[PDB]
Amino acid sequence: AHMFMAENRLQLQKGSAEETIERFYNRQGIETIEGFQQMFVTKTLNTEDTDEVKILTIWESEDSFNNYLNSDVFKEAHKNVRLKSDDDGQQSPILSNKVFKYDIGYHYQK
Amino acid sequence: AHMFMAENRLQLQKGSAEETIERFYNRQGIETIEGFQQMFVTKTLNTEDTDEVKILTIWESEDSFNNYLNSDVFKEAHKNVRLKSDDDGQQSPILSNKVFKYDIGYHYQK
Numbered sequence: 001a002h003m004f005m006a007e008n009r010l011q012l013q014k015g016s017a018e019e020t021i022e023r024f025y026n027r028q029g030i031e032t033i034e035g036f037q038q039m040f041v042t043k044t045l046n047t048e049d050t051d052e053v054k055i056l057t058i059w060e061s062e063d064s065f066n067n068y069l070n071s072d073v074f075k076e077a078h079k080n081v082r083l084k085s086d087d088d089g090q091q092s093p094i095l096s097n098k099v100f101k102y103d104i105g106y107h108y109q110k
Numbered sequence: 111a112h113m114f115m116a117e118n119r120l121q122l123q124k125g126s127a128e129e130t131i132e133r134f135y136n137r138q139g140i141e142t143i144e145g146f147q148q149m150f151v152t153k154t155l156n157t158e159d160t161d162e163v164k165i166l167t168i169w170e171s172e173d174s175f176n177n178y179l180n181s182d183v184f185k186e187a188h189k190n191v192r193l194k195s196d197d198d199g200q201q202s203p204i205l206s207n208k209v210f211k212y213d214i215g216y217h218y219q220k
């Protein structure tokens with residue numbers, strides 16, 4: 001069975017990458033989720049006028065990802081997550097998010 | 111301090127992801143490079159035009175990755191690689207590559 005990766009790509013107001021990444025430091029239950037293997041939270045290195053933060057999650061299967069999305073644990077972790085565009089998103093530097101999905105065809109870990 | 115991720119993004123002819131991914135199964139020395147940690151080879155799902163395959167490499171530092179690019183093993187692994195546009199490359203499904211670079215702000219592995 002092929003592993004699976006999801007990417008949540010966040011476009012952020014310039015300068016806000018570091019404060020946004022810090023939100024991911026403390027766990028909110030992902031460690032309890034069936035099929036979850038790893039998470040990376042990254043800042044893209046470039047000269048763009050917005051920041052880009054990506055959340056990569058590695059899963060034993062797409063199904064395990066799908067089940068996480070429907071889970072109480074996911075819902076709870078995201079209850080206070082808002083976008084700049086939301087009516088109550090005044091304090092949010094998160095301009096947009098876009099989800100990308102991938103088959104992991106090969107993995108090596110030293 | 112912070113880990114580092116490099117991405118090589120391969121823009122491929124439609125349908126060629128799987129044959130391309132198979133070329134990455136066999137290690138060619140990257141695992142001997144100081145600071146190398148992990149490699150993922152991904153296929154982007156639900157693409158309708160060109161196929162897309164990404165090679166993600168995870169490093170102890172940007173310096174480690176920089177050293178890999180200068181290495182003999184990098185050279186040896188890539189010596190027979192051709193883009194479709196190369197004089198002898200017409201049969202290659204590889205249309206282009208683009209490199210992206212990331213600071214890893216947070217990582218969790220179950």
Ligand code: HEM
Pocket residue numbers: 006007008010023024026027028029030031039055057069077078080081082083094096097099
């Ligand atoms: C594909 C759907 C999504 C996945 C797989 C995902 C994954 C995750 C994970 C694994 C965590 C850590 C939670 C934990 O430690 O238990 C998290 C938290 C977080 N996510 Fe997502 N997420 C998704 C949707 C979104 C969306 C749409 C946004 C909008 C910006 C977002 C922004 C955030 C933020 C800001 C945090 C930190 C939580 C906080 O501030 O309390 N996520 N997410």
Ligand code: HEM
Pocket residue numbers: 116117118133134136137138139140141149165167183187188191192193204206207209
């Ligand atoms: C010049 C454009 C590049 C193209 C078209 C390309 C394509 C390829 C191909 C087709 C292979 C498998 C070779 C084979 O069939 O034996 C390969 C190997 C590999 N490439 Fe690239 N590549 C390029 C540059 C890069 C860059 C810049 C990186 C890192 C950012 C990278 C990371 C890797 C890794 C880790 C391997 C496996 C090497 C090993 O196991 O030692 N490649 N590349």
Ligand SMILES: [C-]#N
Pocket residue numbers: 008055
């Ligand atoms: C959420 N990423």
Ligand SMILES: [C-]#N
Pocket residue numbers: 118165
């Ligand atoms: C080469 N990727």
Ligand SMILES: [Mg+2]
Pocket residue numbers: 124125126
């Ligand atoms: Mg296909």
